[PDB]
Every structure is written in C-alpha cells, then in structure tokens.
Design a protein around this nucleic acid. Structure first.
Ligand code: ZN
Lengths: 62, 101, 151, 129, 204
RNA sequence: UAAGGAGCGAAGGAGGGCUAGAUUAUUGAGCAGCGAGAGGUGAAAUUUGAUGACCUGCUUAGGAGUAACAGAGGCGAAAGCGCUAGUCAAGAACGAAUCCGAUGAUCAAGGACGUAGGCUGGAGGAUCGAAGACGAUUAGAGACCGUAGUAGUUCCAGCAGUAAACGAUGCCUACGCUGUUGUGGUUAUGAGCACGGCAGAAGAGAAAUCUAGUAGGGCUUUGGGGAGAGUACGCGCGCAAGCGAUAAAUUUAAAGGAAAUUGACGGAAGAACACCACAAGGAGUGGAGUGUGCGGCUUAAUUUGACUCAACGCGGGACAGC
C-alpha cells in the first residue's frame, strides 16, 4: 500500500559506495520533528524534496 | 646488525615470561612481545536501534556491550594490517591506538 | 553441489542409450542467488582451471557479485561406443548419463541433451528427436525401438 | 490487551554455522529449532547472514502457531579455549525477530569463558597458509 | 502426530519478592501424581531483579535463581537457589591502572543450608593527585580481605533465607563494606558477585 | 673505611618447601526434551548421525590449569616464579652515637644447582600430540591442510649436563653532564640511599651505534686468513643417548668476513592518477555466407619477415605478364 513521507534535504556530506555512486544526506521530515541520515543515489541539490517509504530506517554512520 | 634497541619486546630485568596463543593461527607468542588489540562491540547493530525502539517492552532500554582483548603474532598482525612497515626514523614513534567496535 | 543426470522413460527394443556430454544449463550463483542471464554450454571437452589449478569443464564469473562459479562433468559412462559415444549406465528403469559437480553455483535446469540409441538389433539411431516425450523407429525387419514418457 | 507470553531463544554463532532454538523458561522443553545449514545448499554459505535470516523465519512461524508473543534472547560464540567473538549471522537473527511481530524482553551474552584452560589445538607454530 | 497438543501448562510461583507469578512450563500429560512430581520437581529457572520488582531501571544488573519444590493444582512452588551479576556488569567494571580485590567464604543458615559467597572490590584514584595509576599494595589488600570476611560473617551467618534474600535485594553488604574499609584505602564497586547453594539438608 | 662479618628496630616482594580449601572451563558417562543434519576449509573430501547426532536441561567422574586486572611493574645466583588461607627456615635493602678488628679480591684441581627433550623404577591418564595410518592438492608429495592416533606432556625417588642458557657485552673497585619518569624505605619536606626505564649532550668508534667516555688498579677465561675440524687416536665420566677435552696429512687467494653507499629485483607496504582503466550509459566483435591476412598439411614450387601490450587489410603485400 502507498504509505509515503516527504522530507527536505538540508545537507550533503560524502560521495560513497563502490565507484562513488551514492551521497550521504541529512533530511528533515515535513510534518514531524524527525531528522534522519540517509544515502541517496541520484544527483541531489540542497533544498530538494524526496519521498521515503520509511521514517525510521537509518544510516547511522552519517 | 641490531635493528631495535629493545629487541622488539618489552621484557627488562626478567628471565622468562608467560606465553599466549594467537587469535588467527593459535601459534605461541611471549606475552611481552604479542600485538594487543581492544574491542568494545554492541550486541545490537546500529542499523537495528530504530526497530528496537518499537520492539522493546521497557520504557527505555540500554543495549548490552561485549568486551574483548585479542592477541596476535607478528606474521598475523602484518598480514591483517594492524601494523605496517615504517622508515628508519618513524620506527621510534610510540602512540596508543584506538579501541575498536 | 553434485547433480546426477538421469535419462528416464519407458524403453522398448533398446540395448543402450548414449549421451553427448554437452549440456545447455541454467546456473544460479550460490553467493548472491542471482540466475545467470543466459544459459551456458557445459561440455566434457571444454578444459578450464580453477584458481588452484583444478580441471573443470566450466568457469564463469557472476556478473553481480563477481564470485567465480565452476562446474565439472564426471561421465558415468561404462564404455565408449565407437570411441565417440558415452554409453549411459543402466540403473534399474533409468540411465545414469553423468554427474555434474557445481562449486559457487547451483544447476537449476538442464535444457536438452543430444541422445543416441543403440537398438537390441545393433542399429544406431543418432541424434534422436522426441515429439511430446515420445520417440519410435522401425527397422526393415519390423523390429520396433521406442522411448515413451521421456524425462 | 493480551499479556506477554514469553519463550527463551538460544543462538549460537560460530565461523562455520548458526543454530537457533526456542524453549520454555525452564530450558527443559523445546518448541522449535533450525540452523543455517538446514536451508542452504553450499557449505560455504552456512554462516551467511542470508542463511541465518531464512532459518529464523521458520522458527518465528512455528512459535506464532504455538501461540507465543514475546522472547528473551541468550547469545554466544564457541568459547572455552577457542574463539570468543560472536560470528556473522548472530546479529541478523535478532533483527529478523523484530520484523516479525515479536516483543523483545532482555538480551544477554552468555559465552563460556575459562578462568584458566586446557591446551588449545594447533601446535607451537600454528596453522601455516 | 502433534505431540504438542498433549501437554499441560503449570504456573510458576515464588516468595519474598513483590511479584508472585513469573510464567508457566509444559509437561506431557500423565496419569499418576507421583510421575508429575518426578517430572516437574528438580527443574530450574532464572529471573532478573527488574522483572520481579518495581524499581529503578538501573537495578537490571542482577539475576535470581529458583528450583521447583512442590505441586498444588495449577501451581508449582519454587525456592531460592542462588544469585548472580550479569556479564555486562562484571566485564565493564574492570579497568587498567587499578587493583581488584577478591574473596570466597562459606556460611550456614539457621535452616541448615550451606552457602558459598564470592565478593569483589576495586581500588580508587583520589582527586587532586597526578600519578597515572592507583594500585594497592599487596599487604594492604590482605587487610581489606580480612575485614570483608568479618562483615560477611556478621551479616549472613546463622540467619533465615527470608532474611538473606532481602539483604541481597537491598544490597546491604556492599554498602557496609564501603563504609567499614574506607579507613584502610579508598574503594569503589563493592558487590556480592555470586551466591551458590552447596548442601541442602536431608529433610521431609 | 662511601673494607668485611655478627646483631637491633619498623616495614616490603609471582623468592622457596609443606598442610588444607576454591570460581569456571575441556572431555567421558547417566537420564529427559526435539526429530535432521553436524564437523572442517581458500574451496572441499576422509569422517560421524533414526542403536536419535547437534543444541537445551538436570546429575555425576576424573586429571591439568590459574583468563581479564597485567605494565619497557616486582622477586631470585642463574635456570626460573602469577587463585585463597595457615605454617617452617634463611636472605636483600633502609634507619641509627650496637659489637668484633683485617677476618678481604679473584680463582687451576675439587664440589653443588641447571628450561626443554631423553633414560631407570613406581603412581596415574582430562587436553594436546613425535611415530604410524588415511582423505585431499600436485608431474610427484613421502610434507604444508583436514580426520584420527601412540610414546610422551602430570606427580614421587634418581641419572644425565646440552641451548640464539643473549642485553650475543666476566668479577671486584674508581672518576665522571643534564632533563624526565618509576619501585621500596627515610625525611629540616629542601632532599637523600638502593634497584631501574627513557631522552638529549660531550667524548669515542671503520661505521651502525654506545654495557663501547677517562686510565700501566687487581685477578681468571679466551682469539690469531679460509677449509679439513670441534673431526681421528688415546684417556675420563654415563644404564644408554652421548658429553667433556683435543691433532696431523692434504688443499686454497681470498672468506654468502664486518658496516655503511648506488642500482637491479620481490610473490611488500603507502599515497596519487586515467572512458586507449573501471563503475553508470551507447555501438559492436566472438555465431552464418563472403572478402582478406596467419598457422598446419599438400606440391615441381606453393619464396619470405614479424609473435603479450608494442606479430596476424602489417612489410604503402588490391600477385594474369611485370
Ligand atoms: Zn598468528
């Protein structure tokens, strides 16, 4: 079923993964206090909006 | 020719010392010569703490840690890259390494 | 992993079944569980080596996890007919053609095998083709050779 | 609503294999049991995080049938005079049990340490490779 | 043939704690009370102090052990069988640059049970001091250990089990040791580490 | 006497012998639960399991060991010594207005101790494991790896006498720069005495470095270019294994002799870089027929160079004659 959370990217940190495909990012959710750390794989600009399937799964390494 | 002033070991003012066994190959190595490594590892991985917060029955929970001291012989320490070959002036520098997790 | 290649069916008028030790196979990597994108030809005459100099009939690198996969054919043939054809070993109601030994992979499917029949009258039928699991031939002396329910 | 009906879960995690085994609180009655080697084919995969995860699901299913809801976890490596680090796979059994519905009680490391010990295998030189 | 269907649950009950009932155990169904006694009696379980009390979440470092003793209807009654600190506590306590002090002693209850007790303490580094280590001299360690034994003898010897269990709950022995031995040297982490039942008297 | 021995006071240490106890762990048996695999590796096979393994309970029986704390920390003549109480002798250092008075240094001969492995007799036998036997790998493995397995590994009474028994630096006794950090006593609290570690300096040395500075202080061991040779004959010890001590003939211009310098090499380690590298993306080649070059075979002749990148529509090599 189509659960979704929309989150705003505030910072990018590190090019990451084999071949440097991913970017570590900090994201704040739009309607909750939660702020997460996540890896994202496309090109990303600060102030982008991204759609998450989970509000909890995290990349603690930051 | 003599490569190190301390013969590569920490024994002074003694005849003989206890042996210990290498973690990687079980070889005997003298305690005062063995390469030592300290570990403090959480029982639960960082990628699960966000599930733990909804799984636990308690109001708050502190994850248990696990503690280890590991010993290595020269060959294993070099091969596993705990230590590396260094230049004639670098050999003399002594500094404490980090505790692993 | 070890896999025995049996030829199963109802055999009439057949002295021996002979099998080309050339198998089009589907392989799955035992590391990442991904199926290889194409079938691979496993042949007894293909000579390859592991990274430890062991002879194998197939060496394939998994495209996803880069792991090496190896397969060796052990012919279970009791004899070579005309020095060319591997006579499958008769076992009760079936024929044991070969044993495939996989390392780093699973064999998921054998697609086809080229089969030759030696009749009880000493006639060879090369490269027999099954229609819906059936094969039948008659000689000039009205002797029938047949395979039914081929698997 | 319902009270928490608890079982014990024991986990062994070596370099070679992983064993998972549920019991009553007394340890004297067995409810369900599995291993990494039960589900996988190749011998090199019996320690695999994946094989551990498959094997955990079967155990979780049988417990849900027998009507259990909550679990205490006691986890170990081989110990004695051998290796005393928890092997790969051990920490994926626990995360899997949490994706299934089960409530987690308490976790404890119960590896058998020796105050001093009998002589280890391998001779004075050790394995050469 | 689903043998699981043919099993009887019984509830475990305990005494001298705030929580009376702690769980339930299975057995195959049997015809004769003598068989059920021989099957259930002799079993053992363990419980964390934090589960059998209402208490500060800090007190989770200790476990109590109980042995099944008697059957009445739905209920099995169980008796005190020992105490133990959790592995995380023992391993986390030891630190480099300090001395450990350790002791073993045997005591007798008024009920006739004999108990063996293990005890631990650690030296402490004083403030306004600049030396890297705070080891204790070997002769001084013998003074502390001598004192510990008279404290344990005074607190626990010739008492009832109902009295012992509450002393263990409230951690009175640790507290007494830190008070009494401060004159010899400063100490920290004083605890009863393990309690083990050695002999139970032949009784009916 | 900042020479020695005897003695007094308070204290310190894994120094040694004996007596009585201890928390776990590894194996083995008994019984109970469960119903299919366990073990081992880089990857696998020997091997073991429905006579119920593995894993989880409760009982027991043995014989070793003292984890973490634990260190450029302590003790001992060296070899060596790490759980807790009690007991028995002697020693080192320190404090100080105790006693005797040259009793001392070093040492052929002679005597006592000496890790481990070995030997003679008794006790015992958990774990580990020479020999021996298998499974794999290899051209071959008798080896390395895995399964298993005996003498030994432990104790008491003895024999033996060797180690890279090394800080590769003899023992007493002197004269000698600074800073820092330990251990045990004592203190006018300023410091000392004994036993150490570390970092410079100055001198020294072929250098590396410094137990190596200064010097006709005393006494013992010991070397004299490589080899043959720590071998032969004789002798002394030992149950044996062997050990101690020690030659000639013959050969040869240097000696894998010492340390330091530059290259070449390695199956090392560490940083960098690049679609003629890769990762994420496009078009193909490898399969068919034909065109063309290379090897092989044939022929009277099928003329010939070139072989990893950096040989093979390459030798301006599309040959009817040229
Ligand atoms: Zn090693």
């Amino acid at each position: 079923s189509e659960e979704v959370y929309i989150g705003e990217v505030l910072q990018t940190l590190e090019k990451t993964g084999p071949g440097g495909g991913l970017t570590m990012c900090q994201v704040q959710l739009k309607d909750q206090k939660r702020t997460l750390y996540r890896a994202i794989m496309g090109p990303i600009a600060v102030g982008d909006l991204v759609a998450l399937l989970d509000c909890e799964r995290e990349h603690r390494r930051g | 020719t003599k490569k190190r002033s301390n013969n590569g070991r920490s024994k002074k003012n003694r005849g003989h010392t206890r042996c210990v066994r290498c973690e990687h190959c079980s070889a005997m190595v003298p305690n005062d010569k063995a390469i030592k490594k300290f570990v403090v590892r959480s029982v639960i991985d960082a990628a699960s703490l966000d599930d733990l917060k909804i799984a636990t029955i308690y109001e708050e929970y502190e994850v248990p840690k696990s503690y280890y001291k590991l010993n290595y012989c020269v060959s294993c320490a070099v091969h596993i890259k705990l230590v590396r070959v260094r230049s004639r002036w670098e050999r003399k520098i002594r500094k404490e390494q980090r505790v692993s997790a | 992993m070890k896999y025995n290649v049996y030829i199963e069916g109802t055999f009439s008028g057949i002295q021996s079944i002979m099998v080309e030790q050339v198998y089009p196979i589907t392989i799955k990597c035992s590391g990442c569980n991904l199926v290889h994108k194409k079938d691979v030809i496993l042949s007894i005459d293909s000579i390859n080596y592991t990274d430890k100099d062991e002879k194998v009939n197939l060496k394939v690198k998994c495209a996803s996890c880069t792991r090496q996969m190896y397969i060796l054919i052990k012919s279970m043939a009791t004899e070579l007919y005309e020095e060319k054809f591997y006579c499958a070993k008769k076992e009760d109601n079936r024929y044991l053609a070969s044993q495939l030994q996989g390392r780093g992979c699973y064999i998921e499917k054998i697609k086809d095998a080229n089969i030759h029949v030696l009749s009880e009258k000493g006639r060879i039928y090369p490269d027999i083709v099954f229609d819906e699991g059936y094969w039948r031939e008659e000689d000039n002396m009205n002797n029938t050779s047949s395979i039914e329910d081929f698997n | 609503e319902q009270r928490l009906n608890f079982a014990l879960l024991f986990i062994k995690a070596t370099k070679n294999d992983t064993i998972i085994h549920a019991t009553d609180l007394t340890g004297a009655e067995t409810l369900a049991k599995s291993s990494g080697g039960s589900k996988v084919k190749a011998h090199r995969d019996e320690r695999d995080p994946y094989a551990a995860m498959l094997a955990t699901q079967d155990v979780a299913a049988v417990l849900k049938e027998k009507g259990y809801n909550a679990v205490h976890i006691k986890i170990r490596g081989k110990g004695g005079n051998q290796s005393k680090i928890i092997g790969p796979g051990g920490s994926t059994v626990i995360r899997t049990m949490m994706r299934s519905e089960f409530k987690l009680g308490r976790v404890e490391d119960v590896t058998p340490v020796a105050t001093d010990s009998t002589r280890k295998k391998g001779g004075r030189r050790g394995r050469r490779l | 043939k689903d043998s699981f269907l043919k099993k009887e649950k019984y509830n475990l009950r305990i005494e001298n704690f705030p929580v009376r009932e702690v769980g339930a155990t299975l057995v195959n169904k049997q015809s004769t009370v003598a068989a059920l006694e021989k099957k259930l009696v002799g079993r053992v379980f363990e419980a964390n102090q934090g589960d059998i009390t209402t208490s500060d979440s800090a007190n989770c470092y200790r476990k109590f052990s109980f042995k099944i003793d008697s059957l009445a209807g739905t209920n099995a009654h169980a008796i005190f069988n020992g105490m133990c600190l959790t592995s995380e506590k023992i391993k986390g306590m030891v630190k480099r640059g300090l001395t450990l002090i350790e002791g073993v002693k045997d005591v007798v209850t008024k009920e006739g049970i004999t108990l063996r007790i293990l005890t631990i303490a650690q030296s402490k580094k004083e403030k306004n001091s600049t030396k890297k280590t705070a080891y204790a001299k070997t002769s001084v360690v013998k003074e502390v250990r001598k004192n510990i034994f008279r404290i344990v003898d005074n607190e626990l010897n010739g008492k009832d089990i109902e009295q012992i269990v509450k002393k263990l709950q409230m951690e009175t022995v640790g507290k007494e040791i830190e008070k009494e031995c401060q004159k010899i040297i400063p100490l920290q982490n004083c605890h009863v580490l393990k309690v083990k039942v050695v002999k139970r008297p032949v009784k009916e």
